[PDB]
Amino acid sequence: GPMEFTAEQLSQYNGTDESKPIYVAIKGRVFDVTTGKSFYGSGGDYSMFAGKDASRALGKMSKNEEDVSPSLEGLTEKEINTLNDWETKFEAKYPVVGRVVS
Template sequence: MSAPEPKNFAPKQPVALAPPKEDPISVEHLAKCSGANPDYPTYVAIKGTVFDVTGNSSYAPGGAYHVFAGKDASRALAKSSVKEEDALPEWSDLSEKEKGVLNDWFTFFSKRYNIVGKVTGASNL
């Protein structure tokens, strides 16, 4: 029996990513980036870091993960939940297992999507 693959979350096809940005993004601006308005990109924030998921239909209205778009969805990702009420930035009170899941999601996103900024005033880094 061979050893399991390491958890590196590398995409099947290599993704050319831009250098991460530290641009401040307000919660109000982030909310406009929900995929509902074609004049704005589609963003998902995790632990205060904003990822550009524009072009992935899963985050567009009607998509399986649309609940995450336009907000910091750290709690929902940690809990593997697609419930609107779980799509919140607060995660510090979660179990160690859930925090590990959240860190895995952060790694997954960071290997696939450009980091475009940080949520202004985020305390959940």
């Protein structure tokens, strides 16, 4: 499989380090958004998503810190519709360096 990044490791790219890139989790998939760390990077548009899975937050589109779940273990249709689509938006934009595992 891919590199597969754990929530722990993935949480090491929320934008703040010097080299450490920026990886976002979506439905358990680690995506690359470093292309715009200005948004995800330390304190940015996706400050809550940085080093966190904003699947639910993406779905309902709340960007809530609690809506950031590394698992769709609840993601309803409302969020799924958007979340699921959010995947294509991020997947068809951000490079997948791996998929969230642990």
